[PDB]
Design a protein around this ligand. Structure first.
Ligand code: CLR
Ligand code: CLR
Ligand code: CLR
Ligand code: OLC
Ligand code: OLC
Ligand code: ZMA
Length: 391
């Protein structure tokens, strides 16, 4: 019978409302930016908007629900559940959006060739609708009978003076911890997180191998070239050109058709000279390759390299989003593991719980900062919106 609970409550409520303000405003800005900047209207950013929608709803609904449930007010058992579990629906929706973004970027880097034919806005819209419906079904599963409404706290319900059937609106009293640990954490959160880790691993490895391939083809072009200038045999020259020719048309698979046709044509010219024993003609006809290389091949192998670099830098930016999600949500999941798995442990203290709850809510405010910071197109669009509207 120490400090009045209203004092602790005041800090918690004030902080929660400060978070709600920032989650709403920042994520409204993201949606506004995607709405009037056609450079941002792609499939990838439709999942960004779905993710922003979930974070707006955290400020508008989940946080007010969190404040309400903290009071332990007397209400319907299934009413409490909805208040208690709605945040999950939003958290699950966030998981699906993050997973979809990963797969989208994976498809884009491995088969850029058939990316626009496979991944369309119409199909993305259908994927998003389905994921929202699945998120409701997963998040509100306790309302289907997996709850403690059948086992009410006799003592608490009489202390608070609830009516008949009514019950305080506690979180750990109505939502079973085996649902939270096994179903929600392990299956619905941790498994998708590990899948996202895997997808991003492949993204970075695919980028690393492609770059390499081009570097190998580029060095193959120039070495076989230097072998040409020193050889003394007709077949010695013909060997370095057939190997230079394979590397020519393979680098071609990674306006510019002209650059590669002059190159491969010049190699074939030098080939028939070599076959007819005309060594010095072959060596001199192969020496004009280096100006075709310096006027086309070099120009395309820098441009392909900078495109891959941008895809890597973009993938890193999106991976940070997933990292901060895990950082904000793992403490709460870990606390629940201790509650569930260690009955010999005294329960984590109230101040720590609420610190972990506050931390999970702040994850819906760092997003917009990552965007404007990591992605130029977002930053420039926010700049314009801020400077124009409503000034
Ligand atoms: C976005 C719009 C829909 C506003 C959010 C709708 C919310 C506020 C609605 C949907 C279901 C409603 C709840 C349904 C059941 C109960 C149990 C009752 O003993 C107290 C009221 C309470 C807790 C209701 C409060 C309001 C409620 C939570
Ligand atoms: C990135 C992933 C693996 C994070 C999840 C790690 C979790 C599941 C690990 C990390 C530390 C572990 C806990 C360490 C201590 C205890 C106390 C013991 O009496 C019950 C098990 C329990 C509660 C462990 C359960 C599993 C645990 C919570
Ligand atoms: C994933 C990263 C952030 C590590 C997680 C840090 C926090 C959440 C971890 C580190 C040490 C953990 C605590 C270790 C000891 C106890 C005492 C036990 O009676 C209740 C759980 C509690 C209070 C644990 C809760 C979770 C905990 C506080
Ligand atoms: C983020 C910025 C500050 C975090 C500091 C605020 C951490 C919130 C502490 C919550 C608290 O003190 O809990 C009292 C308890 O809920 C009684 O009902
Ligand atoms: C209310 C809770 C659910 C929020 C409703 C929002 C549904 C998701 C959404 O608004 O997304 C738009 C769509 O992704 C456009 O590209
Ligand atoms: N354990 C828990 N508690 C609460 N609220 C109740 C906090 C509490 C803690 C102790 C106590 O005696 C009474 C109430 N919300 C919670 N949300 C979550 C959660 C959300 C997502 C994953 O876990 N876990 N969680």
């Amino acid at each position: 019978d120490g400090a009045p609970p209203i004092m602790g409550s005041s800090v918690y409520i004030t902080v929660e409302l400060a978070i709600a303000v920032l989650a709403i405003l920042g994520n409204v800005l993201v949606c506004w930016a995607v709405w009037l900047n056609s450079n941002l209207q792609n499939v990838t950013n439709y999942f960004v908007v779905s993710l922003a929608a979930a974070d707006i709803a955290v400020g508008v609904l989940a946080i007010p629900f969190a404040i309400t449930i903290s009071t332990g007010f007397c209400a319907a058992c299934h009413g409490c559940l909805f208040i208690a579990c709605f945040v999950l629906v939003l958290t699950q929706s966030s998981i699906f959006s993050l997973l979809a973004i990963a797969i989208d970027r994976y498809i884009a880097i491995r088969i850029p060739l058939r990316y626009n034919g496979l991944v369309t806005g119409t199909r993305a819209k259908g994927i998003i609708a389905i994921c929202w419906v699945l998120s409701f079904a997963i998040g509100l599963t306790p309302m289907l009978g997996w709850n403690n409404c059948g086992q009410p706290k006799e003592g608490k319900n009489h202390s608070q003076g609830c009516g008949e059937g009514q019950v305080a609106c506690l979180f750990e009293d109505v939502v079973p911890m085996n649902y939270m640990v096994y179903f929600n954490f392990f299956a619905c959160v941790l498994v998708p997180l590990l899948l996202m880790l895997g997808v991003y691993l492949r993204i970075f490895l695919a980028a690393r191998r492609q770059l390499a391939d081009l570097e190998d083809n580029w060095e193959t072009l120039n070495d076989n070239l230097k072998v040409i200038e020193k050889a003394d045999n007709a077949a010695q020259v013909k060997d370095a050109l057939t190997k230079m020719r394979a590397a020519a048309l393979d680098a071609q698979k990674a306006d510019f058709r002209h650059g590669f046709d002059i190159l491969v044509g010049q190699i074939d010219d030098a080939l028939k000279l070599a076959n007819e024993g005309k060594v010095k003609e072959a060596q001199a006809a192969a020496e004009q390759l280096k100006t075709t290389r310096n006027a086309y091949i070099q120009k395309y192998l820098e441009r392909a390299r900078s495109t891959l670099q941008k895809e890597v830098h973009a993938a890193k930016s999106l991976a940070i989003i997933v990292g901060l999600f895990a950082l904000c949500w793992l403490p709460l999941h870990i606390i629940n593991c201790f509650t569930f798995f260690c009955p010999d442990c005294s329960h984590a203290p109230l101040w720590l719980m609420y610190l972990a709850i506050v931390l999970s809510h702040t994850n819906s405010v760092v997003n917009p900062f990552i965007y404007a910071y990591r992605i130029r197109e977002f930053r420039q669009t926010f700049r314009k919106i801020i400077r124009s509207h409503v000034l």
